[PDB]
Amino acid sequence: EPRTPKIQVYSRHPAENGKPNYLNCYVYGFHPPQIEIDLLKNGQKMKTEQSDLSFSKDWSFYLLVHTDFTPSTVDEYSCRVNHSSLAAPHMVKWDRN
Template sequence: KRIRLVTMRLGVQSLAKLSPPKVQVYSRHPAENGKPNYLNCYVSGFHPPQIEIDLLKNGEKMNAEQSDLSFSKDWSFYLLVHTEFTPNAVDQYSCRVKHVTLDKPKIVKWDRDH
């Protein structure tokens, strides 16, 4: 059984093409200054599965939790990284993604109005 599983994984990996990640940054609730909230970075559609995702506050890495790696019907992968935060009028939040398909890290800013 173990040999079959390895063969299956290798077969799937070789069939899938390189796919760059799509990145969405959003808060769980509408943003209100001084009110605790959750910041989410949803990264999807990428292959291979090796990826590095960081939530940033003013360019500095935040402590965050990451969901288990999951895959879609097309064998592309997706992850959710999230953390608690309290928005204000000064701090800037973003999500930084590093993946083999990207020449440089992709940084997507959180837009509090969307």
């Protein structure tokens, strides 16, 4: 029985347009552990770094994916997750608010 991932997309620091920042996607609570995660800019895959896969009795499996980014007034950023508990990949949009 799979357990569906939960997905948090956030910037390391409060967003200001045109200032460099870090974009993060934390996904957790899932089983089985095989999972695919990307960060997207306007629907296109960004180059990212991905933490070590880890397990906790309180969180099941969890992973953090992150990259540099510079928010603007028009550019959209999202996290895309594919996992066997899902019928198709899910995307969560970064919301600066």
